[PDB]
Amino acid sequence: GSAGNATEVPANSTVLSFCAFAVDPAKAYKDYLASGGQPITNCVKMLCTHTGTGQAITVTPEANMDQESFGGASCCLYCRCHIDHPNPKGFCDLKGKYVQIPTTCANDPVGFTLRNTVCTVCGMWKGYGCSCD
Amino acid sequence: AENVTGLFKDCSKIITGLHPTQAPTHLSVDIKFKTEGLCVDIPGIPKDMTYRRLISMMGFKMNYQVNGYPNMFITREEAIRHVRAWIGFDVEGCHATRDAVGTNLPLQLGFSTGVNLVAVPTGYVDTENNTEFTRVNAKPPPGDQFKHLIPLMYKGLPWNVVRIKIVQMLSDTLKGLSDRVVFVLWAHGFELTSMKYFVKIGPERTCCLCDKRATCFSTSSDTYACWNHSVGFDYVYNPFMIDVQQWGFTGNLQSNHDQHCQVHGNAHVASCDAIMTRCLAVHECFVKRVDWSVEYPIIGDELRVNSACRKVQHMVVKSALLADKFPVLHDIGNPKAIKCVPQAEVEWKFYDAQPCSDKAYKIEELFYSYATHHDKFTDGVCLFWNCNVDRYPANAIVCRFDTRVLSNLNLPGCDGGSLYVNKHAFHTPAFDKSAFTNLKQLPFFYYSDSPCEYVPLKSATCITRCNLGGAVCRHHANEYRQYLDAYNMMISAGFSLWIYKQFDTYNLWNTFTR
Ligand SMILES: [Mg+2]
Ligand SMILES: [Zn+2]
Ligand SMILES: [Zn+2]
Ligand SMILES: [Zn+2]
């Protein structure tokens, strides 16, 4: 009986509990977006120069004028829902680093993290995009 | 400003907030990085290398509509449709004293079944790399009533163990009766939280290798399964639940239960609490008498019981009329006319508490009580066929259900009562010797008045249509064999046959002689 520290706000209550219980936390969220549900909010937002590397994985925030900067351990769904990681054992990619997303698609940065995967060539977002291809 | 949730509360005793990365949310990040509503990176002030923060799972509050995803909570109506999907669930708990504080963990998980599973305090804990399911220190809740939970802290058992134990105990209890589960609970919240551990969720799916919808999920290898063909399945794939207290009762569960049922006492053991939640939910819906609008698929063996019910009724009460030549027969517990023996010169009088709108003029409206009604029915004979009452009148033919016996048909109820279901399930009082005090137990016999017509079976007890001989008369010898077979089925489904003390097989022979 708090006596504790609040990490979360009501608007996200429903979604997270859903994704928590799901056998497929990925699909669960995805579908929820379809249901007319609001995407995750309150994830950690950076005050940045907006110049820097465009790269999606950064050790310190690097944003393009187009992209915006996020703590990103907030934008990792499995970190955010406190459930196991897609990686078999056991670790997470987005904890201990930062992540950038185009400002338009930064409405739901959590999905954006799941939806796309960064190439090992330029270490940057694929399709948002790559000098490769 | 601003609004916050009990859900995912950070119960750690850590005084510092979290580095903007490795922090779960902007609410979490420490003051030091926050400016102008934004959060900002300070290479200068380092992220924790090693930390353990307990995350509270409480007030899970899940109400959502997804087209592919089925509601976890069900309507009062929809919960009636599925009964003995019904299992009472109340989980005692413990709080974290030492490494962190502020949330609650499952200690003893109670069930409507006597079963009690205990667990070692286990909670979700956050580290730099991952969220990690692990043991925790915990204390018994503060009250003197809770002093009995102390020993349970040490006892057992690994959660990966428990969730399989739950699924098997749930698997074998529910297998024959239903295709799904519903949990009947008093405090919606805590036991939803306890559900995090064993339960998973998702759009409906079919049992793997099997025909029907899946109850269970196995993590070991991605699979789905039902109650039937499933073991080594550690999870529950799509449970259902409903909150009784959500129905507007005034008091605490113990008060509400204790009025209706004096059979369930109090031990604060978690099962007792989860029994009481069914025992009371049953009463609420099913002591309201015999709603005929509901429809319950039958499996099984019941249909044969259904017919054998009528067959043994017809014959007994026929003979009973021949033997003792009653002027009048008082049928009690007959909503509709429906004479069990269509044709008898006997004056047939109908009584029930609720008459059917059709055939209402034929029936007299009465609630039977031995205290009021022993005086009045003296003349003739009385018939109660599955009309269950306090102690019965001396002159009587009655069929009552014995709660005590167990079939896949009937389920526990208040108080000592069982709730029997084939269709139109009727909750019934508890089997009591005191009600049969005047009547005597009815020995099996077979009576046909007929002309006669592989191996012969000769039976001392039957009034053979022809007893001159052996006499195995291939029509009766076969017909007796069939009736005794469907009679031994009705008694196997646990019905009881009681008759007036006066009745004697012999008086039947006199109808034969001519
Ligand atoms: Mg409870
Ligand atoms: Zn993560
Ligand atoms: Zn690339
Ligand atoms: Zn009771």
Side-chain angles (χ1 to χ4, degrees):
Chain A
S2 62
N5 259 29
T7 198
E8 273 280 16
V9 1
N12 278 348
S13 300
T14 65
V15 208
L16 331 148
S17 30
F18 176 44
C19 312
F21 270 124
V23 251
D24 189 292
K27 159 159 216 48
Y29 189 46
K30 302 183 128 168
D31 296 324
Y32 183 82
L33 271 186
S35 301
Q38 289 281 25
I40 286 187
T41 201
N42 183 238
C43 22
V44 36
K45 223 200 176 184
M46 281 356 206
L47 190 357
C48 194
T49 163
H50 278 51
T51 187
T53 3
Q55 315 207 351
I57 178 253
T58 41
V59 69
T60 74
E62 310 265 68
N64 300 11
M65 277 308 189
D66 326 275
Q67 320 167 187
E68 304 208 349
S69 226
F70 281 86
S74 75
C75 293
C76 153
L77 182 71
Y78 309 61
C79 261
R80 189 62 180 280
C81 308
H82 300 354
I83 68 205
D84 292 334
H85 291 92
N87 175 287
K89 165 75 197 318
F91 308 170
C92 175
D93 316 319
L94 289 220
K95 246 198 146 200
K97 327 271 171 132
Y98 294 88
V99 161
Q100 345 292 340
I101 291 86
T103 310
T104 42
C105 224
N107 193 10
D108 175 271
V110 204
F112 200 120
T113 63
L114 254 167
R115 300 183 208 157
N116 307 75
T117 315
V118 306
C119 97
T120 319
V121 187
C122 61
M124 185 167 305
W125 269 142
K126 197 84 175 177
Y128 275 93
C130 271
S131 179
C132 347
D133 289 85
Chain B
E2 203 51 80
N3 281 331
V4 279
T5 343
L7 214 265
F8 291 169
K9 178 170 82 156
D10 181 319
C11 290
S12 67
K13 292 175 140 139
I14 306 194
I15 189 45
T16 341
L18 255 346
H19 189 285
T21 96
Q22 108 182 156
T25 179
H26 181 303
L27 241 286
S28 168
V29 307
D30 195 14
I31 344 305
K32 343 226 166 156
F33 317 74
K34 276 187 262 168
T35 181
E36 238 170 87
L38 277 283
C39 187
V40 72
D41 175 44
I42 296 160
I45 172 169
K47 355 182 272 189
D48 306 88
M49 334 59 191
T50 159
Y51 67 100
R52 291 227 301 178
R53 290 189 197 245
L54 183 59
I55 298 319
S56 145
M57 310 276 192
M58 297 218 328
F60 242 118
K61 209 184 202 94
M62 38 194 339
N63 39 219
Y64 57 107
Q65 269 305 104
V66 182
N67 287 40
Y69 295 96
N71 316 10
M72 312 217 352
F73 275 83
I74 63 179
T75 350
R76 154 101 91 137
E77 173 186 294
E78 194 181 349
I80 310 292
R81 214 170 304 138
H82 313 64
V83 187
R84 232 327 182 271
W86 283 21
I87 357 187
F89 196 25
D90 176 82
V91 179
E92 299 295 73
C94 55
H95 347 273
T97 333
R98 191 180 279 283
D99 40 272
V101 159
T103 195
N104 260 329
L105 319 139
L107 179 48
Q108 179 176 54
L109 295 67
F111 292 88
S112 5
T113 350
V115 315
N116 270 329
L117 303 171
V118 36
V120 284
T122 71
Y124 289 68
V125 172
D126 305 53
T127 57
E128 344 73 29
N129 24 66
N130 60 24
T131 10
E132 97 189 356
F133 189 111
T134 186
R135 186 158 191 335
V136 193
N137 318 42
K139 60 176 183 292
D144 187 279
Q145 59 287 23
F146 295 107
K147 86 101 175 187
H148 76 72
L149 281 81
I150 297 163
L152 278 130
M153 291 282 180
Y154 325 94
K155 273 227 153 85
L157 247 94
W159 251 103
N160 72 323
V161 154
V162 172
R163 54 234 270 174
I164 224 306
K165 275 210 172 184
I166 270 182
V167 165
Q168 75 136 325
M169 159 271 182
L170 270 241
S171 274
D172 79 46
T173 285
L174 251 55
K175 52 173 39 192
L177 318 193
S178 184
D179 61 339
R180 55 163 81 183
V181 232
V182 322
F183 295 94
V184 262
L185 42 237
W186 188 238
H188 151 200
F190 192 12
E191 295 87 9
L192 204 192
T193 265
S194 292
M195 293 189 192
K196 180 64 184 179
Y197 298 49
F198 49 76
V199 168
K200 226 111 206 286
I201 213 58
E204 280 284 6
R205 285 227 161 65
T206 86
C207 56
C208 129
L209 122 81
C210 338
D211 184 25
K212 46 240 263 56
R213 92 165 211 86
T215 273
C216 296
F217 180 100
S218 165
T219 43
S220 326
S221 58
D222 203 286
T223 27
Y224 290 142
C226 57
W227 294 127
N228 260 312
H229 356 48
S230 121
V231 266
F233 280 59
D234 49 278
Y235 266 43
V236 182
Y237 184 87
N238 257 262
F240 292 83
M241 61 221 67
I242 198 43
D243 189 355
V244 157
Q245 170 270 331
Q246 211 121 297
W247 296 343
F249 304 62
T250 51
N252 68 309
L253 172 145
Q254 171 107 212
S255 81
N256 300 25
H257 178 68
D258 273 12
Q259 299 163 354
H260 315 5
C261 176
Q262 13 273 352
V263 161
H264 300 20
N266 191 51
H268 227 344
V269 206
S271 84
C272 181
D273 255 76
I275 293 167
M276 287 192 181
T277 332
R278 234 186 96 274
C279 166
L280 183 151
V282 151
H283 177 285
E284 267 305 305
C285 317
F286 300 158
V287 143
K288 301 174 185 176
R289 282 75 216 265
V290 204
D291 178 281
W292 266 281
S293 65
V294 288
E295 228 103 76
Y296 302 150
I298 172 68
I299 16 81
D301 164 271
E302 204 289 330
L303 228 11
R304 281 172 61 203
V305 187
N306 243 22
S307 84
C309 226
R310 308 308 110 175
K311 298 180 181 175
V312 181
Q313 179 199 46
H314 173 224
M315 156 134 27
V316 62
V317 56
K318 172 170 63 176
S319 314
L321 279 194
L322 278 41
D324 284 71
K325 328 256 183 180
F326 298 90
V328 63
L329 175 157
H330 300 245
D331 204 353
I332 326 212
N334 205 359
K336 23 182 116 64
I338 315 306
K339 291 173 143 177
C340 58
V341 220
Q343 30 185 341
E345 303 289 80
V346 67
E347 192 193 2
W348 205 305
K349 293 237 176 170
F350 292 146
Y351 311 94
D352 186 32
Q354 276 123 17
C356 265
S357 319
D358 46 337
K359 301 166 138 43
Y361 60 119
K362 284 177 146 75
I363 320 181
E364 176 61 79
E365 177 208 76
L366 253 203
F367 196 158
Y368 194 83
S369 165
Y370 182 94
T372 353
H373 296 149
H374 67 297
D375 283 338
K376 326 291 163 61
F377 292 62
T378 53
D379 71 88
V381 83
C382 305
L383 169 79
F384 315 79
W385 202 252
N386 299 12
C387 158
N388 325 281
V389 206
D390 37 322
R391 106 173 103 236
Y392 287 137
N395 48 256
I397 306 152
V398 53
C399 180
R400 168 75 97 88
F401 196 108
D402 184 11
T403 52
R404 320 188 290 189
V405 313
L406 221 306
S407 65
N408 91 82
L409 275 348
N410 85 145
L411 324 171
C414 19
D415 48 278
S418 50
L419 176 137
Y420 174 78
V421 182
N422 27 35
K423 219 296 88 187
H424 312 94
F426 9 103
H427 178 223
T428 104
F431 182 85
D432 172 29
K433 281 176 192 184
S434 120
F436 311 112
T437 158
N438 316 285
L439 317 187
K440 284 193 171 178
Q441 238 186 339
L442 196 291
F444 169 84
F445 67 66
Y446 167 84
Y447 183 116
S448 188
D449 150 65
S450 297
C452 225
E453 234 51 72
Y454 30 62
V455 300
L457 224 163
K458 170 275 212 162
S459 169
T461 152
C462 96
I463 62 91
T464 84
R465 299 121 124 192
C466 342
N467 212 41
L468 172 273
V472 273
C473 326
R474 210 95 85 138
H475 199 268
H476 341 170
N478 161 273
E479 250 209 20
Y480 164 110
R481 203 131 55 177
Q482 275 185 16
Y483 172 94
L484 172 133
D485 275 22
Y487 176 88
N488 273 336
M489 144 150 336
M490 132 152 309
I491 196 180
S492 270
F495 289 89
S496 186
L497 275 344
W498 293 94
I499 217 153
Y500 41 116
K501 291 222 260 279
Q502 212 206 322
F503 179 89
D504 182 353
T505 289
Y506 179 80
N507 282 4
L508 291 193
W509 294 127
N510 303 16
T511 62
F512 259 4
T513 223
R514 205 281 277 101

